[PDB]
Symmetry: D2
Subunit: 110 residues, 4 copies
């Protein structure tokens, strides 16, 4: 199992650097597996480095509220959580974020 | 304060009906204010009917996992949470969801 | 046949007013049916007012380059064209635009 | 100047292969610079291979209508054109497409 994220700032058309991202797993609420920060190219390649994982519900929380605060920009979102389910645990999963101040998009990248 | 949501199925180009949506407020974790289901036109007009509200972080959870399950369709998301912050509590807030099986978009509508 | 558009500024979370939109039909290249400008609520309700229409390929061009220029903002797009096909000419068609400086989304609204 | 595109099928969460993409430049209408087809990973890495280019308005046309037709799926779009402007001709430009049947997203990737 590999989990990658990358954030794209839609206001600038450039990647969003230094954004905190929290990875969680749904247990019998949610529990932290890892916490990372997006690099110069707005990426966290191994979130989650290549290791075996149990299937089930996962979550990434993009700390984008703190990101816009440091730029002195207003935003609709205090943070952006993305819930996803993994049944094929062998695969590399990309969960990108297309970030605007008052809107966003996310998907399997794959 | 007014809170509305509407879901648009991107596979069909038609609204997504009968989808459960849970509205929550961040307290000193999260607490349910109301639970609704999208109508024939994929809307929940008053989520949250017109009443005074305290500023702070809110959340809507679109139960889209159960939606695709009833259509016998696979999806990346077990559900879709959307976190948002309200500072101007006088306003009508639209939080629409553009729904695909393995991707989505959300925004202030406004 | 009814054709509506509305533009949502993702930087502000408010509708985008005064944006020129050109409606075209594919002929044996493209030909202008109508030209409108988005109102205070970022809408052009009747683009295209309620009248019978021939099925086929249509196009709306959102003059968003001129929009950002008047705000002194840079953008990736000189304008945003959206091609769509209508087979059911009886229906009301919404073609909304979720507008960021360096990214956008469009869909049937319906 | 480098121009890359990649298409992501939002219905499947996998890249969209074998999709024709036409690259054009705005002249004193539009003129074809190159035509490519997306590979197994839904990419056209060099659209446009690394060569010097003149600044101005460009266009990529994603032949997504023909794509869904071969899958026997209905779609709102006969094809998807994306207009973009390049002022810094030294840079590598990614223009990805997040593809659903009745909706899509595009952006600088960068």
């Amino acid at each position: 199992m590999i989990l990658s994220v990358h954030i794209l700032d839609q206001q600038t058309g450039k990647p969003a650097p230094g954004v905190e991202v929290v990875l969680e797993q749904k247990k019998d609420g949610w529990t932290q597996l890892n916490t990372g920060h997006t690099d110069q190219d707005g990426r966290i390649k191994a979130l989650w480095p290549e290791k075996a994982a149990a299937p089930g519900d996962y979550r990434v929380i993009f700390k984008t509220g703190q990101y816009f605060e440091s730029k002195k920009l207003d935003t609709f979102f205090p943070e952006i959580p993305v819930e996803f389910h993994i049944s094929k645990t062998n695969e590399h999963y990309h969960v990108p974020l297309l970030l605007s101040q008052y809107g966003y998009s996310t998907y399997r990248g794959s």
